[PDB]
Design a protein around this ligand. Sequence first.
Ligand code: HEM
Length: 433
Amino acid sequence: MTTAIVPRVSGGEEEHGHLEEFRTDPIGLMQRVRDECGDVGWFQLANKHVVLLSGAKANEFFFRSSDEELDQAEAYPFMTPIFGLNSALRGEHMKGHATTIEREVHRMIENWGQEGEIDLLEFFAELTIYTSTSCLIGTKFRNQLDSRFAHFYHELERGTDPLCYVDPYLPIESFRRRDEARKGLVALVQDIMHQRVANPPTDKRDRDMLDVLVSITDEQGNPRFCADEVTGMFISLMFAGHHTSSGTSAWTLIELLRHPDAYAAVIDELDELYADGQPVSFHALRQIPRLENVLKETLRLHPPLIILMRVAKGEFQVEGYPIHEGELVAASPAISNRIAEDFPDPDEFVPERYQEPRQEDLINRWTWIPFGAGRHRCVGAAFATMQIKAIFSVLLREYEFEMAQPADSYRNDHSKMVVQLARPARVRYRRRK
Ligand code: HEM
């Protein structure tokens, strides 16, 4: 009667609590937490006690917390088996990156020809393997990669089943495949490193991050870094960028196809913009208003990170409720982005939301959170937005697209903590005049 108890959401009668619901319909679970509990409720993942926050006030507490109060890395048990930016994300690099991104889109569609069909999952996942490695690690390194790298990295992402809260090394097939894939990536990187040590650049202009790394010496004069550590570093350099860009690119195309008036306006704007003959490295770095608002609304409806988790490293209070040391704390862009009082008609695709009168992203900084907020904002948000603009500047000016299945049949796979499209998700293309 003196101290409150955070209410537990219904369900979760199994021995690991709500874990099984969390690996089938996590968004429905979080929606129930909101509906039954309000701004502060909790659900159970194995032995973990997840305090789910929602609404502007609780979200603000989350996003203002320090890295030392609410610990990010400890909330994600798959990070250890997977793993083992003054660099790429300086604005001075964006123009060069846009050029790289255009080039990779060109390479992906080189052999498309006049007409055909693609699987959205494969297409955007592979494309963003190459954009991510080239922009975030270097073009010299990406040039020494092939599809074997793409497919191993994919299996890493598929190694994120929430069963990792029982045990990140549970003897299940997707975890075995994950760990084998990490070994395969170490082997690819090891061969590349062998070739780099054999051929150190004689011109410092030819050195990339890997050349520097393999040159580093320890106190006995021996290589400080082995292939395992290098692989882990490179995985971590691109892990925040790949699945998010892949999913967001796919859903941007899907929402364009579900809304052909928005598709038409975006195309008309792109054709008129690029009629000045300036290249993608120019336009992708300046305003493309209708495409930008389509992207903002795609992010609102389909945020690639549906939950953001932390481990409490102390006792806290939020809206009169305690959070105890060791409990997990979470915010949910999936739920937050659709709060009706902030986003009228929240389930509807309305890119006008972001135009001057409404500006629903800017005036709801604690509930419009596809990129996070406060002290935990996506550091690659500008790179991610530029990349989408460059990708669709190429794709939509050179090809036109059509759904190959009903509009309502595109859906996400939530079986893993990394979100990706569910099958089927296919689209037709035809080359433009
Ligand atoms: C494509 C759309 C993207 C979205 C919606 C997105 C979303 C987010 C979110 C919500 C966070 C906060 C995570 C948390 O505090 O728990 C975050 C953090 C971060 N993001 Fe992104 N992201 C995207 C793409 C990218 C890209 C392309 C990169 C790198 C080039 C990147 C790099 C990072 C980094 C470095 C952090 C902070 C460290 C971390 O939390 O891992 N993101 N992002």
